[PDB]
Amino acid sequence: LFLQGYEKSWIETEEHYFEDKLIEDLAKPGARVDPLHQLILLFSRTALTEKCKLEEDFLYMAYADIMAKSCHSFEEKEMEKQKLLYQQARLHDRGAAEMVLQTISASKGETGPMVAATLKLGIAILNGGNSTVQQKMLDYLKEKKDVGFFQSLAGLMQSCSVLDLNAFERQNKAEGLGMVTEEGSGEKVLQDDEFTCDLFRFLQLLCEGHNSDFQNYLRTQTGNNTTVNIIISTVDYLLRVQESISDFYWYYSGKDIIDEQGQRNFSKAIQVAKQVFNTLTEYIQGPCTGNQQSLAHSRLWDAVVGFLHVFAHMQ
C-alpha cells in the first residue's frame, strides 16, 4: 500500500521540463532531412496508410504532447509573441500542419485518445491568429479534395458530450448509499468536456481573425462532391447542450441548495456552451453573408430562447 500511494501521489507530480530542449536539439542538422522532419513524415505516413480503425499508437500519443507543450511592458509582450511564432514555425514548416489534418481525417469520427491528443497539437500550432498556418491547412485541404476530414469532424461533433441527468442523480444516490470513490471523467456525467472544448477551440482558431476563405470553406467545401455543413453541426451541438442545461436546471427547482457536484458539473457545461458560442461568433465575425443566412435559417433561435429562459430564472 505504501508503494501504491507513492506511485499515486509522489512521482507524477510534474517533476520535469524537457519539452523545449528536446525539440530544440531535435531540429539541428549537424551533418537532407531533419530528425524532427523524419518523425513528422513517419507520423504522416502512418496516418495515410489505409486502415479501418485508428490504432492506439503510443508513440504518436507520447510525441504529439511533447510537440504541443513545446509551444508556449510592451517589449515583454512582443518578445514572447514573436518567440511563439518562432516556436510554431519550428514545426509547422516541417509538415505538422498537414500531419494534424491527416490524423484527424484517419479517425472518421471516433472519439479517442488519438484525436484528443492531435487536437491539442492543433491548438498549440494555431495558438493566436496564425493566418500562415490557416492558409497552409486550407491550401492542403483544397489541393487534396478529401471529404474524410470534414465528415470526420461532423462525426466527432455528433458524439462529443451532453450533461445527462439520469447518471448524475444515479451517482448522487450511489454516494448517499456509500462513500464510493469519485469517477475521474466528470463523475461519469460529462464525458471528455476537455475534448469538446479543445475541438471547438480548434474549429474557432481555424477561422480566427477574419479568414473569409476558411469561413466559406467550412460552410460549402467547393471542389468536393459530398460537402457537409459544419455551421449546422455546431448549431445542433449547441441546441443539444442547451436542452441539457435546461433539464439540469429544471432538476434544481424548488431546492435552494447547490452542492459541490451541482456546481462543478454545471460550470463544466457553462464553459462548453461559452466555447461553442465563441466558435459561432468567430464563424460569423467577418461580415460573411453565407454564414449569416446559414445561422438565420437554422435551429439557433430555439437554443437562444432556451438560454434566455434559463438565464431569466438562474439570475
Binding site: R45, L48, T49, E50, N225
Partner: protein, 386 residues
C-alpha cells in the same frame, strides 16, 4: 429484409428519393463486370456445347477475344510498383481493393472456377486440338495460365475473398497434380494461405500428403517449401496439428529433403613406388611390406578416426588415381581403384564387408599389419599380427 417496389397511384408519403452518384471507378468496374460476365458466359456455352457430346461446330468460341480479355483483366489488378510515391501507392491500393470487392460481390470467382473446371477435362494441347480445333488446342494452355493468374490476382490482397472461397481448397489441392497448371495452383493456394487463417482450419492430412507427394514427384521446388512454411504459422499463431503432420510426413525417411552431416578430413600417404605388369619386362609380380602404429585415438572429436591401409591402382599408366575427387572423407577402399583394410572389414568401392580373424579388433596402438601382393593369379592379402 426486402420491400418490393410496386408502381401505384396512391403510394406512401415517406419515400424521399435522394440521388447519389457513383465514382468513375465504380461505374467502370460495373461495366467491365457486365462485359466480362457476358463474354465468359458466351465462352462457357461455346465450350459446353462441344464438350457435352458431338454437335455441329457452329459455336462461338471467342478464343482470341477471351485471351485478350484475360490479358487486360490481369493487368487490371496489377499491384502498384514499389518505386512509387507513398500517397499514389496507397491510392492505387485502395482502388484495387475496391475493385476486388466489387468483383467478388458478383460471384465471378466461382465463374472462373467453373471455367477452369470445364477446361481441365482435357489432358493436353494435342487432346484439345482434335476436338476444338488447332487454334483452341494450342491456346488452351495459355488460357489456363491466364485464368490461374487472374484467380491469384483476385485474391492477392483481400482477407475477405480468401476466407470466402476457402471452401474450394478441396478442389485446388486435388487438381494440384495436373502437371500443366501446378505452378498456378500452387501460387493461388499460397496466396490464399498467407492471408486468411480460416483456410488453415480445413487443411487435413490428405492435403499435406498430396503437397508432399507433389514435392516428391516434381523435384526440388522452393515454392512448396514456402507453402509448407505458411502452413505452420499464419499470423503470429502456430497450428500444432499441421506442424506435427509436416514433421512426421516430410522428414522421417530422409529421402527428401537434402540431408547433411559433419565428417572428418582424411588424407593419404604413398611412397614413390609403381608396379606395372604386362608381357615383357616384369618385376617378379610379388611385393610385401609391413605397417606399425605408435599412438592412436578412436574418437578424437566426434567420430571414429579413419585408419585404413592397402594398395591403390591408377588410371591407365599415369598418376592421380580415380576415386573420391579430393579433400573428402574417402580414403583407400572408397573407390573401385583401391583396396584397403582397417582391422574389421575389407573395403572396396565404398562398401565394407566383415571378415573373420583371430581376435578381430580395430587397429589399436602397437599393431603390426603386413600387406602382400601377387599380381597375376592371386590378389592382395593382409596379415594382422602375423
Amino acid at each position: 429484409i426486402q420491400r418490393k417496389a410496386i408502381m401505384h397511384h396512391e403510394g406512401h408519403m415517406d419515400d424521399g428519393l435522394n440521388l447519389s452518384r457513383s465514382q468513375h471507378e465504380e461505374s467502370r468496374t460495373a461495366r467491365v463486370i457486365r462485359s466480362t460476365v457476358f463474354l465468359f458466359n458466351r465462352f462457357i456455352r461455346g465450350l459446353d456445347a462441344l464438350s457435352k457430346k458431338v454437335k455441329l461446330p457452329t459455336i462461338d468460341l471467342p478464343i482470341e477475344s477471351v485471351s485478350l480479355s484475360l490479358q487486360d483483366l490481369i493487368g487490371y489488378f496489377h499491384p502498384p510498383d514499389e518505386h512509387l510515391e507513398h500517397e499514389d501507392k496507397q491510392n492505387r491500393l485502395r482502388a484495387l481493393k475496391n475493385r476486388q470487392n466489387l468483383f467478388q460481390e458478383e460471384g465471378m470467382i466461382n465463374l472462373v472456377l467453373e471455367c477452369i473446371d470445364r477446361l481441365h477435362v482435357y489432358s493436353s494441347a494435342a487432346h484439345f486440338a482434335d476436338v476444338a480445333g488447332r487454334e483452341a488446342g494450342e491456346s488452351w494452355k495459355s488460357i489456363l495460365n491466364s485464368l490461374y493468374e487472374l484467380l491469384a490476382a483476385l485474391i492477392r490482397g483481400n482477407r475477405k475473398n480468401c476466407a470466402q472461397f476457402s471452401g474450394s481448397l478441396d478442389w485446388l489441392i486435388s487438381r494440384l497434380e495436373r502437371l500443366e497448371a501446378s505452378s498456378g495452383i500452387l501460387e493461388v493456394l499460397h496466396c490464399v494461405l498467407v492471408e486468411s487463417p480460416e483456410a488453415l482450419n480445413i487443411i487435413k492430412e490428405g492435403h499435406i500428403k498430396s503437397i508432399i507427394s507433389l514435392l516428391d514427384k516434381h523435384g526440388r521446388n522452393h515454392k512448396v517449401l514456402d507453402v509448407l512454411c505458411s502452413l505452420c504459422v499464419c499470423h503470429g499463431v502456430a497450428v500444432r496439428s499441421n506442424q506435427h503432420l509436416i514433421c512426421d510426413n516430410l522428414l522421417p525417411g530422409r529421402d527428401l529433403l537434402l540431408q547433411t552431416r559433419l565428417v572428418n578430413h582424411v588424407s593419404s600417404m604413398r611412397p614413390n613406388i609403381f608396379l606395372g605388369v604386362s608381357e615383357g619386362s616384369a618385376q617378379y609380380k610379388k611385393w610385401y611390406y609391413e605397417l606399425m602404429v605408435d599412438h592412436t585415438e578412436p574418437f578424437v572429436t566426434a567420430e571414429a578416426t579413419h585408419l585404413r591401409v592397402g594398395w591403390a591402382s591408377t588410371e591407365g599408366y599415369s598418376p592421380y588415381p580415380g576415386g573420391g575427387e579430393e579433400w573428402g572423407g574417402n580414403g583407400v577402399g572408397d573407390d573401385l581403384f583401391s583396396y584397403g583394410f582397417d582391422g574389421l572389414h575389407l573395403w572396396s568401392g565404398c562398401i565394407a564387408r566383415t571378415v573373420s580373424s583371430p581376435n578381430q579388433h580395430l587397429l589399436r596402438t602397437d599393431d603390426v599389419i603386413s600387406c602382400c601382393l601377387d599380381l597375376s593369379a592371386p590378389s592382395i592379402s593382409f596379415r594382422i599380427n602375423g
